[PDB]
Design a protein around this ligand. Structure first.
Ligand SMILES: NC(=O)c1ccc[n+]([C@@H]2O[C@H](COP(=O)([O-])OP(=O)(O)OC[C@H]3O[C@@H](n4cnc5c(N)ncnc54)[C@H](O)[C@@H]3O)[C@@H](O)[C@H]2O)c1
Ligand SMILES: NC(=O)c1ccc[n+]([C@@H]2O[C@H](COP(=O)([O-])OP(=O)(O)OC[C@H]3O[C@@H](n4cnc5c(N)ncnc54)[C@H](O)[C@@H]3O)[C@@H](O)[C@H]2O)c1
Lengths: 307, 306
């Protein structure tokens, strides 16, 4: 049925988006510069009749007839984006302007992969979509945060001024096969520790909690949101809390490397900074996260074990 | 002495900056696409050896050899998309150029990066409270990210950047049909219309005379201060006092007049200028009365020219 463009389609979330859309029957074109993505992520569809992979940086204009654009082209984990603030800004600015220009020209509906970071260090808990956020416009993260903030602004500008149809997802922390293992976040870190024999190290009693979302739940959110009539931003994330200890335990079992878990009773964890309200997504999209933590960790570990 | 690019050189603040800098013997080039600027604003210099006017949009790359760029090319508030492009593409372009030719770049930012503030007054390490998707975001978010841009080109590429957070400014050449309280009162007084004050006229507005700002910009440009600096006037005056001052300076028989069922909006923001004091030795020095005077003379002249 639909002609669909995915920018960043060779990346973590984008490649799983591709899969789903390729299997629902659509004609998918992937645009990606391979700055962080990888051909292995989409290699299964090369050659297939309805797929096209284009090596292309979104800071360059694109002219293609499509019905829908999922705009995920953007550096995503902190080490990648903080190392190149300028490329990060150019991508979120010039690149969003370009994709919105295409969407306007060809009458595509455009969905933006924004981010809970537009909320900054929140002074409201949890964060709903009303919150304006508390964000340093010139810190070392600002290239991503302000970059994604103004990309949201561009969307509504084109919506208000040129009747572009726009969708805005504010994406919270997400995990699974093909994820990046360098956020030094708790799951990537425990998994690496276990996969190579190391002890899993748990601060204090492992009592701080973390809420992560499994990638296929995200991908369902995105598609649900794209095909809805809600044009204001929608948080997509999983607000279920698991203790850090529980992540150690699950990852230990599922890797099965007989790594030990060990406590540093004098050490400590930071409470998670952001926590998504997703009630608007339940109400307007009928969507919730349905993959249990253990199940997503397993599918993830399965990926990384054989890798 | 210095070769100097001024984008938005032909607008209100820009043309006074041009004035001051020409008078100091620098080589001054103005770039401007005249969306809101006027040649009349710099005709006095057209011809002099040291001056060039170039008609150019900053969303288009530009190559010129200069030592300093004052990047003022932007609508001040108040085409939303063109505003976005201008503050994004435009700033990237000018920082690119500054990279290429080794120029120091001053960004004319705005108190709006603080949004609707939740601390008072606003000093430079306040992060602001800004709606990224509100009716005015394409100005507020565009100037915010313009800042992010300067800092990124500085941290990563060694570009020398300066960032001025400009607060409300008034004076000759300003956009008369502004919306603003001071504007309306000048226009109406000059015409013998009553000056109507909403409520009891006790909401305040703070205003900075243009030559104070221009001084601040130059001081800032030539300092070693790379992080943002508030340039504004913190002195409060009520709307009623504006009305009274303007009525008297104009002398015309306009009468003041309360409309007590009407309300004014409270003053939105108020600069803390400690940092400009300490690190530039700057502060506003033109008293309100004198400034209003110079502003009245201009609107009087300009009513008479258009
Ligand atoms: N994974 C998360 O937790 C998370 C959270 C919030 C938001 N997001 C958003 O999701 C989107 C994807 O992130 P991800 O986790 O899949 O990361 P990712 O890095 O794996 O994917 C991003 C993809 O974009 C491509 N890309 C980057 N810049 C580009 C450019 N200029 N032109 C063309 N392609 C370019 C990369 O090569 C990469 O494949 C991002 O836009 C990110 O901001 C992700
Ligand atoms: N006047 C104030 O109270 C005040 C307050 C806050 C911020 N500022 C900032 O100070 C700067 C100067 O403002 P101003 O009051 O002189 O306004 P202005 O409109 O008089 O000056 C802007 C000038 O820039 C030019 N310009 C606009 N877009 C351009 C483009 N894309 N390419 C080239 N030139 C372009 C306009 O033609 C005009 O000559 C602006 O950046 C504004 O945001 C001023």
């Amino acid at each position: 049925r639909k002609r669909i463009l995915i920018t960043g389609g060779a990346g973590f979330v984008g490649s799983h988006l591709t899969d789903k859309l390729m299997m629902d029957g659509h004609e998918v074109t992937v645009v990606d510069n391979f700055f962080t993505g990888r051909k292995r992520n989409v290699e299964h569809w090369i050659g297939h009749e309805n797929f096209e992979l284009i090596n292309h940086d979104v800071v360059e204009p694109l002219y293609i007839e499509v019905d829908q654009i999922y705009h995920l082209a953007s550096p995503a984990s902190p080490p990648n984006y903080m190392y190149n603030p300028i490329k990060t800004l150019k991508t979120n600015t010039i690149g969003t302007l370009n994709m919105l220009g295409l969407a306007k020209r060809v009458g595509a509906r455009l969905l933006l992969a924004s981010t809970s970071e537009v909320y900054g260090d929140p002074e409201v808990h949890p964060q709903s979509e009303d919150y304006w956020g508390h964000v340093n416009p010139i810190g070392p993260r600002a290239c991503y945060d302000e970059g994604k903030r103004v990309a949201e602004t561009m969307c509504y500008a084109y919506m208000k001024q040129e009747g572009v149809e726009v969708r805005v997802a504010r994406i919270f922390n997400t995990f699974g096969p093909r994820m990046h293992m360098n956020d030094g976040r708790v799951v990537s870190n425990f998994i690496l520790q276990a996969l190579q024999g190391e002890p899993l190290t748990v601060y204090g009693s492992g009592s701080q909690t973390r809420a992560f979302q499994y990638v296929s739940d995200l991908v369902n959110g995105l598609v649900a949101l794209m095909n809805s009539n809600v044009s204001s931003p929608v948080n997509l994330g999983n607000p279920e809390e698991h203790t850090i200890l529980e992540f150690a335990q699950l990852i230990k079992n599922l890797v099965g490397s007989g790594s030990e878990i060990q406590f540093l009773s004098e050490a400590q964890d930071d409470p998670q900074k952001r926590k998504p309200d997703i009630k608007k997504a339940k109400l307007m999209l009928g969507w919730e996260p349905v993959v249990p933590l253990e199940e997503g960790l397993n599918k993830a570990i399965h990926y990384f074990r054989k890798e």
